Design a binder for this molecule. Structure first.
Ligand SMILES: CCCCCCCCCCC(=O)OC[C@H]1O[C@H](O[C@@H]2[C@H](O)[C@@H](O)[C@H](O)[C@@H](O[C@H]3O[C@H](CO[C@H]4O[C@H](CO[C@H]5O[C@H](CO)[C@@H](O)[C@H](O)[C@@H]5O[C@H]5O[C@H](CO)[C@@H](O)[C@H](O)[C@@H]5O)[C@@H](O)[C@H](O)[C@@H]4O)[C@@H](O)[C@H](O)[C@@H]3O)[C@@H]2OP(=O)(O)OC[C@@H](COC(=O)CCCCCCCC[C@H](C)CC)OC(=O)CCCCCCCCCC)[C@@H](O)[C@@H](O)[C@@H]1O
Ligand SMILES: CCCCCCCCCCC(=O)OC[C@H]1O[C@H](O[C@@H]2[C@H](O)[C@@H](O)[C@H](O)[C@@H](O[C@H]3O[C@H](CO[C@H]4O[C@H](CO[C@H]5O[C@H](CO)[C@@H](O)[C@H](O)[C@@H]5O[C@H]5O[C@H](CO)[C@@H](O)[C@H](O)[C@@H]5O)[C@@H](O)[C@H](O)[C@@H]4O)[C@@H](O)[C@H](O)[C@@H]3O)[C@@H]2OP(=O)(O)OC[C@@H](COC(=O)CCCCCCCC[C@H](C)CC)OC(=O)CCCCCCCCCC)[C@@H](O)[C@@H](O)[C@@H]1O
Ligand SMILES: CC(C)=CCC/C(C)=C/CC/C(C)=C/CC/C(C)=C/CC/C(C)=C/CC/C(C)=C/CC/C(C)=C/CC/C(C)=C/CC/C(C)=C\CC1=C(C)C(=O)c2ccccc2C1=O
Ligand SMILES: CC(C)=CCC/C(C)=C\CC/C(C)=C/CC/C(C)=C/CC/C(C)=C\CC/C(C)=C\CC/C(C)=C\CC/C(C)=C/CC/C(C)=C/CC1=C(C)C(=O)c2ccccc2C1=O
Ligand SMILES: CCCCCCCCCCCCCCCC(=O)O[C@H](COC(=O)CCCCCCC[C@@H](C)CCCCCCCCC)COP(=O)(O)O[C@H]1[C@H](O)[C@H](O)[C@@H](O)[C@@H](O)[C@@H]1O
Ligand code: HEM
Ligand code: HEM
Ligand code: HEM
Ligand code: HEM
Ligand SMILES: CCCCCCCCCCCCCC(=O)O[C@H](COC(=O)CCCCCCCCCCC)COP(=O)(O)O
Ligand SMILES: CCCCCCCCCCCCCCCC(=O)O
Ligand code: FES
Ligand code: FES
Lengths: 25, 435, 380, 380, 109, 56
């Protein structure tokens, strides 16, 4: 059989935003 | 007078433990002198060499997985963080006089031990020595092969080098974590948590040096005890009937021949352990989950499983939000192969319909079906063994990179059938050759 | 059967026959190897056997000498004593194997040329016992059971079976009760409480907004300080094995930092392969449902752990954009969301979202959207 | 020797007697435990055996339940669950021990109350075996040796003995050659060339004028486990173990420093007792030859390793000035240069010269003038 | 039923190994019933218990002298440097269910 | 460990002529070394119990 959660998509996508980094580790 | 001293010692022994009647029966035991009957002698002799060399190795081996910094004499690995198992293995090869010689002899003895069992298995299979009353001896011997199958695998992983470390991640974890319902529970019980854990080598070391050899020694003792009291069979010939043993007595022909054959096995093993280099662990360094060695290179005894993994197609099942990976087929295939091998005489006596006492070995040509099946099994095993060197084989024809697995995946049904047909026709032709 | 008087005058030849007759052994043929004593052929054979035996003693003496007086210490490659060291182990096996091999050869030649040929037939008494040992042992066992009167006392028999069974179940359960560990017991602290080991990895955030850098290993991973990665720290058509490194993990100069760095390298799901595709190749790029916005420009991050059996796939062909796992020879099309094309692999490699922080070093945009590594029963 | 037709008409009792006669065993007494049937005592005895078996089964079931549901995890001191955890292991042995013990008690009672009482006499037939067996077994061995033609081949016989002896000697040396190590191989760096391990210790200077501080153990792992010490830090009549510490050793924060400090703690000859003799008792101090100036006023430094067998002798009594070894009760008089005064010790503890540097920290004034620890054959 | 099976297996074993005279000669051996003659069995029984408990202990013991830092459940020893032999010895008695019981029985045995 | 240090080490090294050679050989170096425990573990789980079972 084929993996259900593994399906290709044709969505273009967006450029990820700049990571900020939360304080208080 | 040496004769007087021997008589006094013999009189003292007899007057205390009266073994004269028992000893005379032992000295008068008759064993056939066929060449193929020494196959089991090599496996037993190789086991003794493993016992002697294995004890020597334990005096310098630390099975710990604790991280340490190398500081031996090996320049290329100076300052490299490694485990205690890898450092002591390097200590044996370099900082211990004769340690490399003993280590290579011990590995070579394991290969001869594994090879002898498989070759001796064919002799029992082809000659039909598994029939009654020796049906239970086949079961005991079959368990010995399975125990020796894992015993060699565990010992190969003791140095914890890159090659062996990848074989305990590809086989002992992925295949164990891929089992349905109770697959990650076993992986947790055998590693003590996730991979690599911290009790992998110490648990394997205890299993490998004492617990598995203890069961093997007990099974071998029962195996040898059976053959001694079953009056080992003989080939048909002049004067050979079902109610007699034709050969030589234990004293002095068999004892000298059997004892001197042990010397050759030690000599052959010793020569190979010095001249031929096996398992160089220092080239690739300690095992690291980050880096990787090309292959999961096993020895030939534990190599057919790797070939089956590559040749089997990527078939996986996902029943109701779950996963059944490709590793289940390999593990299930091992169970079917082992179950069929163990209960072979019981199946044969169901289809052939014979349940009579047998003491004369069947000629392999007399049974074409069994001979063809055995040849088919041997050919299938050889193809699976050679299936994991596809990297070298691929760079021989340069017709396609992925077509070497298609040769293997197609050749698993065509080549065994061809060998079965050739063996079946050859057995029939040999039957009429002298008739 | 014969009395002591007869045995007084019996010779050794007929005494052996009497002993074999009792045991059922009949020596039907026996002849001395050399019918005529003093012949030159027999004397020549004696020397040949002795020569083999003397070779073992000479080789055995050589083994003692080479073990003591010979350069055995390891020598570096390309040294003045490297050649002598390379002959140490082979000489150990040459002087030891040949010493005992020749002894065994000489002994066999002794029993094939000097011990007389004999063939003996022993009557094997296989099958059932001769009906007198069978009846007695059957009665002996039956008398013990019938005499003990255990069959007619059901209360004792039932209690014995239940008592032994209850003790055995408790003992066996307490014998294998220390090896059983729940694989799903929350032990790894994550952003959302504690999760199981398999659901987490080195990239799992321990708190919301945690910054994890795709740090490169200066030398051997876990033994050298980790250095942050700039987006253009890999030419178009390369690959770097990044690891999950935090700012609080240090650079290994302290023991607590070295232990933290060692755990990063020892992580079975930690390594991630960073691949940069040339800008002239993005037309034939297919994304995955849920991971469309995971790449950062021309940079793709895929886990180095193979989805088949967990082997870290290090080989990668930049020409075909194929990720090859060296264990079982599985290729992973990087253009088609690292989907397995050939081999026993059946699931695509997990993709780690990546982004850029204020500084400018490649950071992970979050956690994996699927478990990393080999599949198990409870996956997906 | 009954026939087949004669063995079919025999009862079980006759067959058992026949088997015993064949084996040489005669049962002179054999009677049932309850010849009179239908008695209340027999039923009572049946229940007594069953009750013990039922108790064993109940205890075995309890072991299964206790091992699975009782709180077993360790609880820290002062916790609510400490009492329950303290009974975890005791409950394991109580249920397991009582289960199999009760089964054994019931089995003993069944044998002593239901299995018939029997007395059996078996002929020993010990001593020398019958002459028929004695002659046949001797002839078989003698014929094998004499018929093999081995005695009259002196060259073959001597070669086999020499070959086997040489091979055995060669393989014995190689087997234990790796274990053998030279005790006196110079491997320890020292100001005056490499020296053997037994001749050196942590207080041995690695170069001329090296400063070794009398550092004290802070008792905490890492974070400066050893710190410098001043003479004023110890009052009169006090004792404190000191260790050889150098500036290059470091504070243990780094990995390299911690490894360096590990050998100091693990040094067998490293610990040294620093005692402050009371000023009023300073007139009773007797100095050893060559060690008169080894003290810094009222401060004396003696090795902590007992000269007898190597145990740490740190039972220093301040008033009697007696250092007691807890292993074999050796007593040393601290006033008289740690001279032994009781026990099996026969040599005084080595004295370490001490002084202070410019900063006022206690430092060693050289190395020991005699070897430290247990004596050996090559000592003094 | 059960009686037939007893004779079925009994004949099967005899038809293959003929263990009738040998077994009967072992089930007819006479041993004196003196109390002091059971003293040697206690040593034999203790050795068997040592074998069973010893095998269990080998599955959790790491025999190493490499120094490590304790991070187990035992509070009075947190952070104390120790060898792996002492590290796993505490794990058996604290981190393994029934390990202390097996360890104590083995030492008493 | 205190019992090992006294009994196994001090007595062994106190033996005449060949006393420190046995200690050096058994401990693989000076006390405590790094090989004593694994060697003792091997001798205690495989060698000595194996001889005892054979003798028993
Ligand atoms: C008979 C055999 C034939 C087959 C048919 C029978 C069996 C079919 C029937 C069912 C059956 O198979 O049962 C056997 C199994 O039982 C137990 O498995 C169950 C369950 O099945 C598993 O799937 C489940 O995964 C286990 O939960 C663990 O993960 C949970 C999370 O996961 C979910 O999420 C996963 C991935 O996603 C998330 O990933 C991470 C999770 O945090 C995070 O990253 C993140 O959150 C992410 O989420 C995202 O989600 C969204 C995205 O869109 C958004 O919201 C966000 O973006 C977010 O990021 C998926 O991958 C998973 O699939 C799943 O969906 C955690 O929540 C838990 O905390 C824990 O960690 C769970 O365990 P539990 O609840 O602990 O225990 C319950 C109980 C079992 O009940 C039974 O029915 C037992 C009886 C029937 C079975 C046979 C036994 C009885 C027969 C007799 C004994 C025989 C005499 O236990 C037990 O008694 C088991 C005892 C041992 C077995 C004895 C056998 C006998 C021994 C001798 C042979 C385990 O023990 C397994 O080992 C065991 O095999
Ligand atoms: C038969 C038995 C009956 C009894 C009678 C027979 C034996 C009686 C006959 C003799 C005998 O007993 O031999 C056997 C022994 O032999 C070897 O012992 C010899 C010697 O005896 C030892 O005393 C000596 O100590 C060994 O040197 C080591 O330290 C030396 C230094 O030390 C001196 O200083 C010590 C302390 O002071 C200094 O301390 C430190 C030293 O640096 C520094 O802090 C500092 O310098 C300080 O000095 C100060 O000094 C002044 C202060 O005023 C000022 O200047 C300054 O202020 C400064 O500070 C004292 O404590 C010591 O006593 C000593 O005086 C170093 O110099 C070396 O480098 C090394 O480290 C040395 O070894 P080598 O030279 O290496 O080898 C040679 C050869 C042995 O010759 C033989 O005759 C062998 C044949 C006879 C024996 C039997 C064997 C043959 C029979 C057949 C085999 C049987 C078939 O080897 C070998 O073949 C041995 C092989 C193994 C034995 C096989 C037996 C058979 C096996 C099967 C049974 C070792 O192997 C021992 O283990 C072994 O037992
Ligand atoms: C340097 C270094 C540290 C290296 C590693 C250390 C290491 C591993 C060292 C190895 C040392 C070893 C192994 C030394 C070997 C030395 C050796 C064997 C020398 C012998 C030389 C010699 C003088 C030869 C002849 C003299 C002589 C009479 C002595 C030999 C004694 C022996 C071995 C006699 C065996 C007799 C006997 C009854 C056994 C037969 C085999 C057994 C156990 C039974 C199994 C068995 C049965 C029961 C059958 O029914 C049967 C039926 C038909 C065919 C075969 C068999 C069969 O094999
Ligand atoms: C005329 C008439 C009616 C006649 C009456 C009959 C008569 C005359 C008398 C009766 C007697 C006869 C002769 C008749 C027949 C009787 C008869 C049928 C007897 C049967 C007896 C018999 C079958 C033998 C006993 C079997 C036995 C002792 C042992 C069981 C062994 C068997 C069968 C199973 C083998 C399976 C096995 C051991 C598999 C292990 C492998 C697996 C799957 C483990 C999982 C696994 C693990 C855990 C890893 O560690 C691993 C590591 C690395 C890679 C992978 C794996 C991995 O997959
Ligand atoms: C009513 C419940 C019991 C049923 C009654 C009948 C009993 C039958 C067998 C069960 C006995 C085993 C006792 C288990 C103990 C328990 O209750 O633990 C719980 C364990 O989960 C569970 O409830 C699941 C139940 C048991 C499932 C076993 C899994 C299946 C098989 C496949 C496992 C493989 C074993 C090898 C044989 C297979 C090879 C076949 C050829 C929670 O685990 P946890 O607490 O996380 O881990 C702790 C450690 O930390 C701590 O060191 C210590 O080890 C423990 O404390 C441990 O528990
Ligand atoms: C694994 C370690 C093994 C050892 C040490 C061993 C050793 C021996 C020896 C010495 C014999 C005496 C006759 C001979 O050498 O041919 C023998 C016979 C025999 N073995 Fe093995 N063998 C092993 C494995 C096996 C296996 C794998 C099987 C079956 C699958 C097996 C089944 C038998 C049988 C049936 C006989 C008696 C054959 C006959 O009487 O004709 N053994 N074995
Ligand atoms: C009986 C069948 C046995 C097989 C098939 C076997 C196989 C192996 C193999 C292949 C190795 C790896 C060799 C190398 O890395 O160069 C090994 C290592 C080892 N074996 Fe065995 N062995 C057996 C018996 C034993 C026994 C009885 C002992 C008893 C102590 C033992 C002790 C060891 C030890 C300590 C090592 C690790 C030494 C090292 O890796 O350098 N082996 N074994
Ligand atoms: C692990 C050690 C030992 C074990 C397992 C053991 C076990 C046994 C057993 C079960 C018996 C059977 C009869 C009886 O119990 O009295 C026995 C008898 C005997 N034992 Fe021990 N015992 C051990 C130590 C010793 C020692 C230390 C000695 C002598 C110094 C010894 C000498 C004997 C003798 C001579 C007999 C025969 C007594 C007779 O036949 O009446 N055994 N042993
Ligand atoms: C006559 C036989 C034996 C004796 C007298 C014996 C004695 C002992 C003793 C007194 C301890 C100390 C336990 C403790 O301090 O808690 C111990 C530990 C140990 N034994 Fe044995 N033992 C024997 C056989 C075995 C066997 C056959 C094995 C393995 C199959 C084994 C494996 C172990 C292990 C691994 C330990 C260390 C575990 C620990 O200390 O937690 N022993 N032994
Ligand atoms: C995996 C299965 C394991 C089976 C274990 C043994 C279970 C069957 C017991 C066989 C007893 C048969 C007695 C009998 O009356 O049958 C008899 C079969 O003939 C025999 O006596 C065979 C003798 C072989 C017995 C020796 C084997 C070892 C037995 C040890 C018992 C402690 C029937 O005799 P009968 O016809 O009643 O005169
Ligand atoms: C035995 C051979 C069985 C073959 C089953 C093939 C199933 C393929 C499933 C896909 O997905
Ligand atoms: S492990 Fe990657 S291909 Fe099998
Ligand atoms: S060890 Fe110090 S008194 Fe014996």
């Amino acid at each position: 059989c084929s993996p259900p959660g593994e399906t290709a998509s044709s969505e273009p996508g967006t450029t990820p935003a700049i990571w900020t980094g939360s304080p208080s580790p | 007078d040496f004769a007087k001293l021997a008589a006094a010692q013999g009189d003292a022994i007899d007057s205390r433990y009266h073994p004269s009647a028992a000893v005379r029966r032992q000295l008068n035991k008759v064993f056939p002198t066929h060449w193929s009957f020494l196959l089991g002698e090599i496996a037993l002799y190789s086991f003794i060499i493993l016992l002697l060399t294995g004890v020597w190795l334990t005096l310098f081996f630390d099975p710990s997985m604790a991280h340490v910094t190398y500081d031996g004499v090996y320049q290329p690995l100076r300052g490299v963080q490694m485990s205690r198992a890898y450092e002591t293995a390097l200590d044996i090869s370099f900082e211990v006089r004769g340690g490399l010689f003993v280590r290579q002899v011990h590995h070579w003895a394991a290969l001869m031990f594994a090879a002898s069992i498989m070759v001796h298995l064919a002799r029992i299979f082809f000659t039909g020595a598994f029939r009654r009353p020796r049906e239970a001896n086949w079961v005991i011997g079959s368990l010995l092969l399975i125990l020796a199958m894992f015993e060699g695998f565990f010992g190969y992983s003791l140095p914890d080098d890159l090659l062996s470390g990848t074989g305990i991640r590809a086989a002992l974890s992925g295949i164990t974590m891929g089992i349905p319902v109770i697959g990650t529970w076993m992986h947790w019980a055998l590693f003590g948590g996730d991979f690599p854990g911290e009790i992998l080598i110490p648990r394997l070391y205890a299993l490998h040096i004492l617990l598995i050899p203890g069961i093997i020694l007990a099974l071998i003792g029962a195996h040898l005890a059976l053959v001694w009291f079953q009056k080992h069979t003989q080939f048909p010939g002049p004067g050979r009937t079902e109610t007699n043993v034709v050969g030589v007595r234990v004293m002095p022909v068999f004892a000298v021949k059997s004892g001197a054959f042990f010397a050759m096995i030690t000599g052959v093993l010793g020569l190979m352990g010095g001249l031929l280099t096996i398992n160089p662990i220092w080239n690739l360094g300690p095992y690291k989950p980050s880096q990787v060695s090309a292959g999961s290179q096993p020895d030939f005894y534990m190599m057919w499983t790797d070939g089956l993994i590559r040749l089997w197609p990527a078939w996986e099942f996902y029943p109701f939000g779950h996963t059944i990976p490709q590793g289940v087929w390999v593990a299930v295939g091992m169970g079917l192969v082992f179950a069929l091998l163990i209960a072979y005489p019981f199946i044969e006596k169901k289809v052939t319909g014979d349940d009579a006492h047998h003491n004369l070995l069947q000629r392999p040509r007399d049974v074409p079906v069994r001979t063809a099946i055995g040849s088919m099994a041997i050919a299938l095993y050889l193809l699976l063994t050679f299936a994991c060197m596809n990297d070298i084989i691929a760079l021989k024809f340069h017709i396609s990179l992925n077509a070497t697995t298609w040769i293997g995946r197609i050749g698993m049904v065509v080549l065994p059938a061809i060998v079965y047909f050739v063996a079946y026709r050859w057995a029939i032709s040999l039957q009429r050759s002298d008739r | 059967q014969p009395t002591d008087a007869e045995l007084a005058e019996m010779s050794r030849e007929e005494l052996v026959k009497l002993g074999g007759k009792i045991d059922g052994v009949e020596t039907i043929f026996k002849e001395p190897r050399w019918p005529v004593p003093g012949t030159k052929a027999e004397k020549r054979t004696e020397r040949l056997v002795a020569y083999w035996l003397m070779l073992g003693g000479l080789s055995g003496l050589a083994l003692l000498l080479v073990f003591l007086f010979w350069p055995w210490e390891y020598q570096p490659f390309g040294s003045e004593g490297e050649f002598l060291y390379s002959l140490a182990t082979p000489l150990y096996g040459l002087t030891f194997g040949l010493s005992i091999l020749s002894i065994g050869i000489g002994a066999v030649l002794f029993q094939k040329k000097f011990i007389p040929e004999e063939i003996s037939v022993q009557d094997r008494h296989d099958g059932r016992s001769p009906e007198v040992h069978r009846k007695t042992v059957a009665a002996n066992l039956t008398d013990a059971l019938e005499g003990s009167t255990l069959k007619r006392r059901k209360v004792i028999g039932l209690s014995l079976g239940i008592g032994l069974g209850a003790f055995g179940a408790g003992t066996l359960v307490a014998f294998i009760g220390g090896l059983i560990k729940n694989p799903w017991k929350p032990v790894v602290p994550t952003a959302e409480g504690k999760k199981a080991v398999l659901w987490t990895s080195g990239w799992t955030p321990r708190f919301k907004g945690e910054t994890i850098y795709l740090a490169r290993a200066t030398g051997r991973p876990g033994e050298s300080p980790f250095v942050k990665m700039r987006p253009e720290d890999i030419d178009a058509g390369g690959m770097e094995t990044v690891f999950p490194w935090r700012e609080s993990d240090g650079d290994g100069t302290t023991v607590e930092s070295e232990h933290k760095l060692t755990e990063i390298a020892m992580g079975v799901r930690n390594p991630v392969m960073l691949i940069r595709i040339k800008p002239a190749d993005m037309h034939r790029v297919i994304k995955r449902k849920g991971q469309e916005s995971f790449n950062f420009g021309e940079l793709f991050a895929y886990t180095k752990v193979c989805s088949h059996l967990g082997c870290p796939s290090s080989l990668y062909e930049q020409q075909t954009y194929r990720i090859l796992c060296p264990c079982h020879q599985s290729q992973f099309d990087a253009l088609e969301f690292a989907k397995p094309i050939f081999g026993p692999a059946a699931r695509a490699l997990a993709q780690l979202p990546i982004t850029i922080d204020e500084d400018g070093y490649l950071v992970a945009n979050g956690d994996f959207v699927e478990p990393v590594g080999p599949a198990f029963w409870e996956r997906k």
